[PDB]
């Protein structure tokens, strides 16, 4: 708040909530988040939020806020629920109520 745009703030409740207890959740404890199902995670969460629905558009935007998914990169990545699109961001954890007010468009 006091700065956190309505963008990251949404990633706070979105990742939480119950209806989204499968399309997106916290990784293990609370280091970041992941979206195993990248399908319904688009035409069922972006419209009631960003309105648009383009998927690669949401991820293409993550590259602007500063993200680094450790997956899909000149390496095998076929179906495998163990490397699910994991987004790592040392500035989007639970505690430390000062990370949100730091990530911005470059």
């Amino acid at each position: 708040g006091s700065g956190v745009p309505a963008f990251l703030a949404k990633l706070w409740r979105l990742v939480d909530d119950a209806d989204t207890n499968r399309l997106i959740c916290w990784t293990k404890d609370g280091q970041s988040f992941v979206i195993q199902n990248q399908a319904q995670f688009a035409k069922e969460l972006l419209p009631l939020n960003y309105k648009h629905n383009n998927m690669a558009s949401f991820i293409r935007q993550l590259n602007m806020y500063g993200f680094h998914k450790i997956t899909s990169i000149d390496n095998g990545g076929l179906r495998f629920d163990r490397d699910e699109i994991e987004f790592s961001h040392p500035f989007f954890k639970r505690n430390s109520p000062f990370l949100l007010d730091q990530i911005k468009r470059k």
Side-chain angles (χ1 to χ4, degrees):
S2 315
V4 184
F7 195 104
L8 306 169
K10 283 170 182 195
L11 310 177
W12 195 96
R13 289 187 183 165
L14 190 83
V15 178
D16 194 72
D17 286 359
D19 194 54
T20 83
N21 185 257
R22 82 196 180 165
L23 292 156
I24 177 165
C25 65
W26 296 92
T27 75
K28 291 188 186 167
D29 295 322
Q31 291 189 297
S32 83
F33 50 96
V34 48
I35 301 156
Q36 317 192 96
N37 286 115
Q38 303 173 12
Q40 243 171 340
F41 162 86
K43 64 195 312 196
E44 202 177 39
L45 288 174
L46 315 176
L48 317 183
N49 287 121
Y50 306 102
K51 208 177 184 74
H52 64 58
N53 185 6
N54 285 322
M55 205 300 173
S57 174
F58 175 77
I59 294 189
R60 168 260 184 165
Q61 283 165 10
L62 294 176
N63 286 222
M64 296 204 272
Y65 315 142
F67 273 91
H68 181 81
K69 63 196 281 174
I70 27 276
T71 185
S72 181
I73 162 153
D74 68 84
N75 194 278
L78 35 54
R79 58 101 203 165
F80 206 62
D81 195 54
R82 303 83 228 313
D83 63 356
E84 31 272 14
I85 177 187
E86 176 165 62
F87 279 116
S88 164
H89 200 2
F91 284 90
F92 187 77
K93 308 277 170 164
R94 284 273 279 165
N95 302 161
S96 286
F98 74 93
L99 310 174
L100 311 187
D101 194 275
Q102 180 166 185
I103 294 154
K104 74 309 196 177
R105 193 174 74 165
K106 206 87 195 313

